[PDB]
Amino acid sequence: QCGPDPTDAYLEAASGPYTVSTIRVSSLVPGFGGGTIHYPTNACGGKMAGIVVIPGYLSRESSIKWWGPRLASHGFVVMTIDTNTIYDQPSQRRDQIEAALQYLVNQSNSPSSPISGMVDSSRLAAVGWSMGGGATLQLAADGGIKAAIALAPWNSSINDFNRIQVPTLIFACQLDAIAPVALHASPFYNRIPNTTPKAFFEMTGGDHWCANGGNIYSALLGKYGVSWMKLHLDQDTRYAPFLCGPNHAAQPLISEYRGNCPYEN
């Protein structure tokens, strides 16, 4: 689709090619707690996919805000959000992801928004951390987003994740003591139907915050995360060989990889 041919260095860089502007979204917005819209101002032309990023229990927008610039600078409209309260529960978080996505669609079709005309509503995704990652997987099981990324997800083991038909990438944090991989990210990944494109990247040594960015894992998180959205939202197959082919487990910072490559289409 749009932009430079990708390379490892280009995808591992702290910033993608585009300058990013931001809009503050007030907490008075209906259906979620406000946040920040990130959008590129010099991307090559058309409408873009829209992405919502949601934090976990007890946590604010600031905890996941790193994903906003990193995705937006590669040609996405990306809204990092607060929930209504930091104590919100899993199904409430799932409802708020959906309200936030609806907000991006509504503002793109508004006469008073800097992102008027910029969001393609057929190409929407969610990124979520912890309880917000469990809520992202729940939304994925409902079927109405086009891609999902879960960051150290936490969820009840009673779930519908064996119904997920949405391409899903899970980042697991090897030493997670809040959502231990063996009890959360790993069984969630396993249950996703094997007819659904999926990937599992476990980060060596990571605690529960490891997949939030702004740390030693940034280069790999950003490379795989942007490649996931480019491949599955934009259908940009130039990003497939960064996800399918490489010996991911040879990386010092990868302690386990799973996937069902090649992603056919």
CA end-to-end distance (rounded Å), the chain: 15
Q: Distance between CA 116 and CA 110 in Å, rounded?
A: 6
Give SS3 for 91: helix
Q: Which of 176, 234, 248, 255 is catalytic?
A: 176
Q: For this experimental structure, what is the resolution in angstroms?
A: 1.8
Give SS3 for 133: helix
Task: Write down the domain spans for the chain.
Answer: 1-265
Tell me the two tokens of residue 144: 């109405």
Residue type, position 60, single letter:
R
- Is residue 130 annotated as a catalytic residue, yes or no? yes
- Is residue 74 annotated as a catalytic residue, yes or no? no
**Beta carbons within 8 Å of 33's beta carbon, 6+ residues apart:** 27, 81, 82, 83, 84, 85, 96
Give SS3 for 200: strand
Q: Which of 38, 74, 208, 248 is catalytic?
A: 208
Give SS3 for 111: coil
Q: Which of 59, 108, 130, 255 is catalytic?
A: 130
Determination technique used = X-ray
Q: How far is C-alpha 52 from the chain's CA centre? A: 7
At residue 196's C-alpha, the angle toward residues 193 and 201, to 5°, is: 90
Residue type, position 55, single letter:
P
Contact 190, 209 (CB under 8 A): no
Could you tell me which of 103, 113, 110, 112 has the C-alpha nearest to residue 51? 103
- Is residue 208 annotated as a catalytic residue, yes or no? yes
Q: Distance between CA 86 and CA 88 in Å, rounded?
A: 6
